[PDB]
Amino acid sequence: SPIEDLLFNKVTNGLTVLPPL
Amino acid sequence: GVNCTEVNVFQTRAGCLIGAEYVNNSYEC
């Protein structure tokens, strides 16, 4: 959605990061 | 998170899976 896109375009060793489900 | 070219293989976005194949249909997991 356009509001979702506007929200998306506003928020920017041994330490892995698990991806969300 | 390992591109396992240095170790049935399917590559997810969470890593690579060994021992499980890929199925087109979907069910509640």
Ligand SMILES: *[C@@H]1O[C@H](CO)[C@@H](O)[C@H](O)[C@H]1NC(C)=O
């Ligand atoms: C794994 O490496 C190959 C070659 O370096 C690359 O083509 C492939 O996209 C890589 N896997 C992922 C999930 O990016």
